[PDB]
User: Fold Proto-oncogene tyrosine-protein kinase Src from Homo sapiens.
Amino acid sequence: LAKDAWEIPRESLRLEVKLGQGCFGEVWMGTWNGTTRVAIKTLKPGTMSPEAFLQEAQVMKKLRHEKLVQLYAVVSEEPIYIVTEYMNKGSLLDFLKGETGKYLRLPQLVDMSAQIASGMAYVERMNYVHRDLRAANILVGENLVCKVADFPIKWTAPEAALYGRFTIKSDVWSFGILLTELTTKGRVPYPGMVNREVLDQVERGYRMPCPPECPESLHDLMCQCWRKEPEERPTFEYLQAFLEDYFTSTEPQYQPGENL
Ligand SMILES: CC(C)[C@H](CO)Nc1nc(Nc2cccc(Cl)c2)c2ncn(C(C)C)c2n1
Assistant:
């Protein structure tokens, strides 16, 4: 049991409000040392081994970026506690689907999306691969900030859904699905379809239409993310810049509508 200087006393932590749960332990709001808000992820001794739930610290240590949720400190010898930065509006999905959700318009959702891509472009640069990129795995905070971090066939690229080839380009596919999430404010993609239809239909060439009031320059870039041949889908670096300049270069004559 030799460990890094990320290591803290497990009395400095102060598990306060229970955020949620799940199969792989639970997650809490709280306090580390005196002040500092913190998320506190834990492992249930029951599910997976010490080496398993201390892989996402092998990585979460090396990876520092503005839009990846930052590891603050761990406690390795079980019971386990991963302490990270607090994101205080919950997943992208909740946020976008709850009280504030209805007030967001396109400038705001496009900006969120530019941030997600900024993070998936740092992911990109490091030759990493996320493998489950969707709104539910994005977290939101003060100032509409959005950080990446942490069976979904509907968000997953064909080549991964069937042949298990996850690549950063198969991540781009989900990005485009995630663009439907931002643009309809929370809705499951492919509405009123079970998974076999989604696999069936994307295979015969179907693609989600343009959502209500969604400018057609947005949809094009969803279709760019949904190209059959994965080497063609654009990089997170292209995606990011496009979304950064959206309202000057692409739609500089955009007027706010009923919803977007
Ligand atoms: C327990 C889960 C349901 C939630 C969201 O998926 N997990 C969660 N919520 C977080 N925040 C949060 C804030 C308000 C309400 C709720 Cl439910 C969650 C959070 N902040 C930082 N992290 C991790 C990167 C450690 C977080 N993780």
Notes: The chain has two domains: 1-86, 87-253.
